[PDB]
């Protein structure tokens, strides 16, 4: 006996047909459009969406006045509205079945950094995040797959200890200034 925990999950699933033109093309389109590293990220987002859809489908078959349906449906809708995927005016359960993968991909810190104008490309956004130039509120966030909360969106800055925000030149500027 030890004092360790062994709970763990697989965050993605693999497609059953490995080679098919349409799936490969759609995944490549998503990867190129959102600057993703591989197809595992696409499958990860697909898996979270599939779990959400499964929970919603389980809740729909229940009675409308069923307290469990009300409780977890409200929780699911509030979680989806909170991260910005759902609209507050579309807070009914069936609308969950209308969500797409691009909605979850648009809420990443990479895409939001690109959209806010902190970077000039989605790939530049990824390298900016991974290089500790980006902060959310006061916390420096290093993870591109950081689902930005709807309230947290207005606080995305340049990480005032970084050269782009805090005006301290980096290695290259210092070395090239010493050469003068």
């Amino acid at each position: 006996p030890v004092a360790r925990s062994w709970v763990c999950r697989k965050t993605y699933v693999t497609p059953r047909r490995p080679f098919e033109k349409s799936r490969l093309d759609q995944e490549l389109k998503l990867i190129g459009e959102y600057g993703l590293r591989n197809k595992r990220e696409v499958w990860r987002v697909k898996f979270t969406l599939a779990k959400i859809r499964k929970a919603a489908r389980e809740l729909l078959t229940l009675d409308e006045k069923d307290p469990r349906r009300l409780f977890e449906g409200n929780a699911l809708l509030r979680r989806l509205v909170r991260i910005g995927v759902l609209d507050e005016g579309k807070m009914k359960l069936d609308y969950i079945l209308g969500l797409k993968i691009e909605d979850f991909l648009e809420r990443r810190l990479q895409t939001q950094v690109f959209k806010l104008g902190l970077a000039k490309s989605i790939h530049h956004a990824r390298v900016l995040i991974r290089q500790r130039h980006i902060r959310v509120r006061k916390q420096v966030v290093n993870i591109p797959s950081f689902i930005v909360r709807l309230d947290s969106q207005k606080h995305i800055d340049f990480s005032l200890r970084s050269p782009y925000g805090g005006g301290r030149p980096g290695r290259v500027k210092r070395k090239n200034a010493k050469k003068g």
Binding site: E20, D94, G98, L99
Partner: protein
């Protein structure tokens, strides 16, 4: 330039029949592909499902012909399937496209649960059969996509169904029977007597009655 021969062709060209659904209402046979090209020419796409060489044994050798299967249909409400066999592959494909256009049937689409938005799936569970191949379409929730084999999936996407469950039994390796079976299941969607169609029908005038004089003078 199209010069119609049938009465229906003359009525369609002369701006008398306004929609293909008026032709479907009276179950009129469509024998001119220019009618389909006139009504849905912009939105129609085709897809050659299979080219199969068939052979007839003769005293000297095997005479080989080519059979093309072509699925056609705008991805909203309409779909057709055509099979044509000819000595040249290009002729076979052309003929199969013509036949697929001549076989366009309407597709009825319904809802899985709540009736919010446009219809997205089959109205109910339907079944098509063609020579030991049985294809069953089941209504599916919104956003589920088409869970089927590639061959039925092509036709189901082409018809306009967004979400569908599928079960197939038999020798689905024969692409022709598989395609004809899923086409049959699709065609049966507007022949199922659901309660919303229980209302007594109001009979209108057929195009041959509405435009008798125009046909007389043309």
């Amino acid at each position: 330039e199209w010069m119609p021969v049938t009465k229906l062709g003359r009525l369609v060209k002369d701006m008398k029949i306004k929609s293909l659904e008026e032709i479907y209402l009276f179950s009129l046979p469509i024998k001119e592909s220019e009618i389909i090209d006139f009504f849905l020419g912009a939105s129609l796409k085709d897809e050659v499902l299979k080219i199969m060489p068939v052979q007839k044994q003769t005293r000297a050798g095997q005479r080989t012909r080519f059979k093309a299967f072509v699925a056609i249909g705008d991805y909203n409400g309409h779909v057709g399937l055509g099979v044509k066999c000819s000595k040249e592959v290009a002729t076979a494909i052309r003929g199969a496209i013509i036949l697929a256009k001549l076989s366009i049937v309407p597709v009825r689409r319904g809802y899985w649960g709540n009736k919010i938005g446009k219809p997205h799936t089959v109205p109910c569970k339907v079944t098509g059969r063609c020579g030991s191949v049985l294809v069953r379409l089941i209504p599916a929730p919104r956003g589920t996509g088409i869970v089927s084999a590639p061959v039925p999936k092509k036709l189901l996407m082409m018809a306009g169904i967004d979400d569908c469950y599928t079960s197939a039994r038999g020798c689905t390796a024969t692409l022709g029977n598989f395609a004809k079976a899923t086409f049959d299941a699709i065609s049966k969607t507007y022949s199922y007597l659901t309660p919303d169609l229980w209302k007594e029908t109001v009979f209108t005038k057929s195009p041959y009655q509405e435009f008798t004089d125009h046909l007389v003078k043309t």
